């Protein structure tokens, strides 16, 4: 089954292509409506695969150097192997001398396409965590933040180094455990510092006066975090506090840049408001004037945006180059400046968390999930990820989209048409988790094409690791080319890969126009129909959901930025450019479950029609979990047959969706905002705005008309 195929391959190799059969002719490759692409998840979790503690075994050919895999042609008699990429014949390493048919290397078995190796030869570097705390906020919000940070500290590894930077008007780099005094270095949050400057101004396992091992500093740090007080500087009437966000962050990057360059480090910045005293400034201290809105940005009424944006982009590139991750945790009612800072967590594989207040379960729980561990009590985070892709000669790489940076490498694998971060064969990914999902765009320049994803990274344990994934897909049979290809289509994967591109061009500016010309080009090439006859159009069960996915995506909050704040839009796209397929789909097309006495919970169309009065709805907008009570059921809740032991039945119904909302409302990293509403409730809007040019019906009709007409 083509479905069982798509499924098993995503499980084994954490990959999902737009097409599993590829063009074998230059004429069809160029006429590919949706590009040959993949949703790649370099560190996907699975059935406890056995780690290889022996070197991987590379090919002997300067340029190639592909890793020995199941596709390689082996010859146990002559202790030789042929690289399936450059055909180069290779001798086995001495430790492979005992090689035999009845006991052969794991990397050759098809079950081990996708395998991990460990390299041990250099003393491992300890992880590094740098807290960068804002102090311009309310007492309750700050106390919450401190408790949140003290907790995270008890979860850290003994050998991990820690550092603390606090800010408000000034910026304080704390020298940890200086006994009986507790000192820090103050800097004006009014002017930036490179790193060479900072270094000169500031002066067996490594460490600094500023970055010390947890086991030796945890108590002092736990106390300092506990005594942190709000910015001493008073905030005059009608004024915002002076917050030097941009300089504090530039000082954090600089500190690490000159202390531990090129090693896993996590710069976690906690924000309570926007930067008001740039570099990095996002607004002025006059409360009179509001923080830019998208409207403001379109009518050229936002003097700080571009300048501030430029500041965090340089920082993002500074840290991403050094191999350091930047997390931004922002909590406040008004906006924070996420739009201007987004690149920091985006280029590096840093996290972006947004909430109303640090003193909420929403934030608290989302923050500790960050330190979630695996069956070995080890963080589900990787640092300094270097992704390298090997392709058959017939294949080239256009580019990638997602959390990563180009290492600007050159080779015959690089294609002319660059997409997202492309024109390279290697990408850095300062921060990665078992969830990170990149998008790789390829171009076609017996059968079977091959691609090898080589990912090297620093494990939480400190070990250097190399994940290897070698997939293979059939070259389309010339005597059926388009038929074989159309059967291999992965509508979901294509929706997200196409969606990925649209959001990329938008956040890098019509986009909806491009999305449509392709949806139409797809209908004409793979649909069924009599020209000039709309009612005749149909799609295989292989393509039928694509238009609908397209519908929802073009009305989604990802391309219709208004009705949302610039920060909210940056937050949304952030999570959508990292997510794996399934999560991505939900983001684009929220799932909807219905609950009623007549039958068990069942999914239902995201249509207004699905909103009944005697039904409870559960909507999952990846970002939010919402429970709606039909008019009828709202009364029964109001006139509460609460303590009526008579209605144990009415109790099961009311909590059915609630139970289901518990489960998911945990496994999900960014904890979703929970919403309990009903007909009449003001919050029902979220449901009413996701459901339903206009409707899908009309949308579809217009599509069929255009599809059966001119090409």
């Amino acid at each position: 089954t083509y479905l069982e195929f798509i499924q098993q391959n995503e499980e084994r190799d954490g990959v999902r292509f737009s097409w599993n059969v590829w063009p074998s002719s230059r004429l069809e490759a160029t006429r590919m409506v949706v590009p040959v692409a993949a949703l790649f998840t370099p560190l996907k979790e699975r059935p406890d695969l056995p780690p290889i503690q022996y070197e991987p075994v590379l090919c002997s050919r300067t340029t190639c150097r592909a890793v020995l895999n199941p596709l390689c042609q082996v010859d146990y008699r002559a202790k030789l192997w042929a690289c399936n990429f450059c055909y180069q014949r290779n001798q086995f390493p001495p430790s492979y001398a005992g090689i035999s048919e009845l006991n052969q290397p794991a990397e050759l078995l098809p079950q081990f396409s996708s395998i991990e190796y460990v390299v041990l030869r250099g003393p491992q570097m300890p992880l590094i965590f740098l807290y960068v705390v804002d102090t311009c906020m309310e007492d309750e919000d700050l106390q919450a933040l401190k408790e949140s940070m003290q907790m995270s500290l008890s979860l850290l590894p003994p050998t991990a180094l820690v550092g603390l930077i606090t800010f408000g008007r000034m910026v304080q780099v704390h020298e940890l455990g200086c006994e009986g005094i507790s000192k820090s270095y103050v800097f004006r949050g009014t002017k930036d510092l490179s790193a060479k400057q900072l270094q000169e101004m500031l002066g067996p396992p490594p460490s600094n006066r500023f970055l010390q091992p947890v086991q030796k500093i945890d108590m002092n740090l736990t106390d300092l975090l506990g005594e942190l007080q709000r910015d001493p500087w008073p905030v005059p009437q009608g004024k915002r506090p002076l917050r030097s966000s941009g300089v504090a962050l530039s000082i954090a990057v600089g500190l690490l840049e000159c202390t531990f360059p090129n090693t896993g480090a996590r710069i976690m910045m906690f924000i309570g408001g926007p930067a008001t005293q740039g570099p990095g400034m996002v607004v002025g201290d006059e409360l009179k004037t509001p923080i830019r809105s998208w409207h403001d940005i379109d009518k050229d009424n936002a003097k700080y945006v571009k300048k501030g944006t430029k500041h965090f982009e340089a920082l993002a590139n500074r840290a991403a180059t050094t191999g350091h991750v930047i997390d931004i945790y922002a909590c406040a009612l008004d906006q924070t400046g996420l739009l201007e800072m987004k690149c920091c967590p985006n280029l590096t594989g840093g996290y972006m968390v947004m909430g109303d207040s640090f003193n909420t379960s929403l934030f608290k729980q989302t923050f500790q999930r960050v330190f979630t561990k695996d069956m070995h009590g080890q963080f589900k985070m990787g640092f300094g990820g270097t992704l390298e892709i090997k392709t058959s000669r017939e294949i080239k790489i256009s580019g990638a989209i997602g959390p990563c940076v180009s290492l600007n490498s050159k080779g015959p694998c690089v294609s002319e048409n660059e997409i997202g971060t492309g024109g390279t064969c290697q990408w850095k990914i300062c921060g990665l988790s078992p969830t990170t999902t990149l998008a790789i765009y390829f171009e076609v320049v017996g059968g079977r094409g091959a691609i090898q994803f080589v990912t090297q990274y620093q494990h939480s344990s400190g070990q250097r690791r190399i994940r290897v994934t070698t997939i293979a897909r059939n070259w389309a049979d010339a005597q059926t080319q388009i038929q074989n290809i159309a059967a291999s289509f992965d509508q979901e994967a294509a929706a997200i890969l196409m969606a990925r591109l649209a959001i990329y061009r938008a956040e890098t500016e019509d986009v909806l126009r491009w999305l449509d010309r392709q949806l139409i080009r797809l209908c004409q090439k793979f649909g069924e129909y009599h020209k000039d006859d709309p009612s005749s159009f149909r799609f295989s069960e292989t393509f039928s959901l694509y238009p609908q996915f397209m519908f929802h995506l073009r009305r989604s909050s990802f391309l219709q930025v208004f009705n949302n704040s610039p920060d909210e839009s940056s937050y949304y796209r952030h999570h959508f450019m990292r997510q794996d397929l399934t999560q991505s789909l939900i983001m684009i097309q929220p799932i909807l479950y219905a609950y009623s006495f007549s039958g068990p919970p069942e999914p239902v169309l995201l249509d207004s029609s699905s909103i009944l009065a005697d039904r409870i709805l559960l909507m999952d907008t990846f970002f939010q979990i919402l429970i709606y009570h039909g008019e009828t059921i709202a009364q029964w809740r109001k006139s509460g047959y609460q303590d009526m032991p008579e209605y144990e039945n009415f109790r099961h119904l009311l909590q059915a969706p609630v139970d289901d909302a518990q489960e998911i409302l945990h496994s999900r990293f960014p904890m979703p905002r929970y919403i309990d509403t009903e007909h009449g409730g003001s919050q029902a809007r979220f449901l009413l705005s996701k459901v339903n040019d206009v409707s899908l019906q009309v949308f579809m009709d217009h599509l069929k008309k255009l599809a059966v007409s001119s090409a």
Partner: protein, 731 residues
């Protein structure tokens, strides 16, 4: 008495055995008796020449020396509902006014007649006219702003070398010991700053477990790091500051910092006080070499280098003028074992009315002497009274004009001496000239007024008034000459001559004053003849010429010379004299011709000896009173009685090398000597340390550099000096 002429070449024993006393103006009885105390105010010429011509003929400088804020026993404090002051020149109603219409008074300075308000009533019996020294309570218009609170800011250098000297401990120890004695009420504010290559602020909040060391590393762009707890309220934070004082010493032991950024540090210190003003105490141990204010090292001279002084930069002068404008005074504590260019650093104190303290080669283990000395100088420093945001003016009767001022302060518009801080140990001098013949008058007056804010937030005006007679005869001018006052005023003059020209010129000008005065005398009357009043003139000048301030052939170092000049410029007349020409007494044989009047204490009064090694004796013991310290020299062949009954040793050989003081033995000899020493110390409020260390071979016999009457390889002997003077006098 005696209007007799003296031949310095025949007496050669002029120096009296009793302490010298200031001359008594030739005034009527009733007037002289109200005159101002001479330890406070005084003149080079008690008989003011009537004309500039007459003054010039006498070839003697005309000027005043003063100690305006000197600690007194009894001070008349008027709380007058109104300050009576002449409506023209604004002079304070004093005891030397002319009361006529018994409802109208004649101002003794500008002669105008004023009306005595119906509040001043026998108006002549009023305190303001029965006292030359008096303190007034200033009304609201005598203050540009609410009385500032008392603010103390201690700025410590913590460089590697600073750490090695180990002074921070005692300083902190003294502060702890004297926290409650610092002048001031509940409004007192105290702060602390340390520094090396960076500036270290210290926040103190009761809410926090421990003090915060806020460090600014931007040396070219200093700034205050916090707004509320750097200058804390002592009363409320006593505890908090006490921990800090106990913590600081232990904070830099392992320091590797080698450079000191004194400039930036002081600028930061400035910004922190700029808002209230106050007193900044700076403790530096080496040449500044980092940041603005940087100073280049210099090579120390030697007994070989000729007379070929001034600041190498104006940074510290500019900074002081700024401190001054914000009512900030800066006291400098230099405890350096190497050249530190005090010639440039001093400026931070001179122009801000501060004062510099020098402890050469200070070390906690190696230099026990500098250690005890700092201790006692800090004791006085930290507990003496203090006045804030003050100004002073010296007014003199019409005809007379002040043209040059001497001392640490800043001169606003002529005679508006700006004094950010005013201490009871600072002395001042002034140079006047007769701009208008005093033919009209027969009496002239001088009035100085000190306007300041007390440690208790009260504006006060302390006033002194001196009245002197006018004379029109060369002879009368000489009869009133105050030899010590002239010595003092000449030193100040000589110091400026040094800065302004060279040390040579300064040394010549000094010798010329003696020559020209005596020469002028002679041309108005075989051997060197001088009037009685000037019989010690050549002696005190020679003394002045052999002092570390002007001496030449010596092996003296730069900072020492400058520090010496700093003292001439800021020290009260008496200490200037005790230092230049220390009092020498024999002390291994004291007896009963003393002040055995003091109820249960006798107190021998041994005769004063002239500063010649010929007055010594290898069989005795001699004490030298040099004002700031007391050196007891013991002879090699001293008696056993003095060794065991006074020193507590059995033989000369075992007299402990550095001996910081005498033991108190149960012996009459000890009681006699301890009595004498203790009386000497009671004659001043700055406890002078004593040290016997002056053995006949402690290589510390720097007791001799004071026998200013003997000849050195590079200095004339008292007698040679007289010989050289006489050769010129009648050339």
């Amino acid at each position: 008495e005696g209007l007799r002429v003296v031949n310095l070449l025949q007496e050669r024993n002029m120096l009296p055995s009793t302490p010298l006393k200031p001359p008594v103006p030739n005034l009527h009885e009733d007037i002289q008796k109200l005159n101002c105390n001479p330890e406070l105010f005084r003149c080079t010429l008690t008989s003011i020449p009537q004309t500039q011509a007459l003054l010039n003929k006498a070839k003697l400088p005309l000027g005043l020396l003063l100690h305006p804020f000197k600690d007194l026993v009894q001070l008349p404090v008027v709380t007058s509902s109104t300050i009576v002051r002449c409506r023209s020149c604004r002079t304070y109603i004093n005891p030397f006014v002319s009361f006529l219409d018994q409802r109208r008074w004649k101002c003794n300075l500008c002669y105008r007649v004023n009306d005595v308000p119906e509040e001043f009533l026998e108006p002549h019996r009023r305190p303001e006219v029965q006292n030359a020294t008096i303190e007034f309570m200033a009304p609201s218009e005598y203050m540009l702003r609410p009385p500032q609170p008392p603010v103390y800011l201690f700025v410590f250098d913590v460089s590697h070398n600073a750490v090695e000297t180990g002074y921070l401990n005692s300083v902190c120890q003294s502060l702890l010991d004297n926290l409650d004695l610092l002048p001031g009420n509940t409004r007192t504010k105290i702060g602390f700053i340390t520094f090396d290559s960076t500036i270290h602020f210290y926040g103190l909040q009761e809410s926090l477990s421990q003090p915060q060391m806020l460090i600014v590393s931007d040396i070219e762009d200093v700034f205050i790091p916090m707004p509320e707890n750097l200058l804390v309220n002592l009363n409320e934070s006593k505890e908090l500051v006490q921990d800090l004082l106990k913590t600081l010493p232990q904070m830099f032991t392992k320091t590797l910092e080698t450079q000191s950024a004194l400039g930036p540090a002081l600028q930061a210190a400035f910004k922190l006080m700029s808002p209230t003003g106050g007193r900044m105490s700076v403790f530096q141990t080496q040449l500044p070499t980092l940041g603005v204010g940087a100073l280049k090292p210099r090579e120390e001279p030697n007994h070989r280098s000729s007379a070929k002084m001034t600041p190498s930069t104006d940074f510290y002068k500019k900074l002081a003028l700024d401190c001054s404008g914000q009512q900030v005074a800066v006291d400098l504590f230099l405890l350096s074992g190497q050249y530190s260019d005090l010639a440039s650093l001093g400026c931070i104190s001179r122009y801000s009315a501060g004062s510099v303290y020098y402890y050469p080669s200070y070390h906690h283990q190696h230099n026990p002497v500098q250690v005890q000395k700092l201790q006692k100088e800090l004791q006085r420093y930290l507990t003496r009274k203090i006045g804030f945001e003050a100004v002073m003016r010296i007014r003199c009767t019409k005809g007379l004009s002040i043209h040059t001022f001497h001392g640490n302060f800043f001169v606003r518009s002529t005679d508006l001496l700006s004094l950010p801080n005013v201490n009871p140990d600072a002395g001042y001098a002034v140079q006047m000239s007769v701009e208008e013949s005093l033919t009209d008058t027969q009496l002239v007056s001088f009035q100085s007024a000190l306007l300041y804010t007390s440690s208790k937030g009260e504006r006060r005006i302390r006033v002194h008034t001196l009245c002197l007679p006018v004379v029109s005869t060369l002879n009368d001018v000489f009869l009133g000459a105050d030899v010590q006052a002239i010595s003092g005023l000449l030193a100040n003059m000589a110091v400026d001559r040094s800065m302004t020209a060279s040390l040579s010129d300064a040394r010549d000008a000094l010798v010329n004053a003696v020559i020209d005065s005596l020469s002028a005398y002679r041309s108005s009357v075989p051997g060197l003849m001088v009037p009685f009043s000037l019989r010690l003139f050549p002696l005190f000048v020679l003394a002045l010429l052999k002092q570390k301030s002007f001496q030449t052939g010596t092996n003296a170092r730069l900072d020492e010379r400058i520090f010496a000049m700093c003292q001439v410029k800021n020290q009260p007349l008496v200490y200037l004299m005790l230092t230049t020409h220390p009092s020498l007494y024999r002390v291994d044989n004291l007896s009963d011709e003393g002040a055995l009047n003091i109820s249960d204490r006798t107190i021998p009064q041994p005769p004063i000896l002239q500063l010649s090694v010929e007055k010594l004796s290898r069989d005795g013991a001699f004490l030298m009173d040099a004002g700031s310290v007391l050196m007891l020299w013991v002879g090699k062949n001293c008696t056993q009685n003095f060794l065991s009954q006074v020193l507590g040793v059995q033989n000369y050989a075992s007299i402990p090398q550095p001996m910081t003081d005498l033991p108190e033995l149960d012996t009459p000899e000890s009681a006699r000597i301890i009595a004498f020493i203790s009386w000497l110390r009671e004659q001043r409020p700055f406890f002078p340390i004593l040290y016997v260390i002056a053995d006949e071979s402690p290589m510390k016999a720097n007791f001799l550099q004071n026998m200013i009457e003997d000849r050195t390889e590079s200095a004339l002997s008292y007698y040679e000096f007289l010989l050289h003077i006489q050769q010129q006098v009648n050339k």
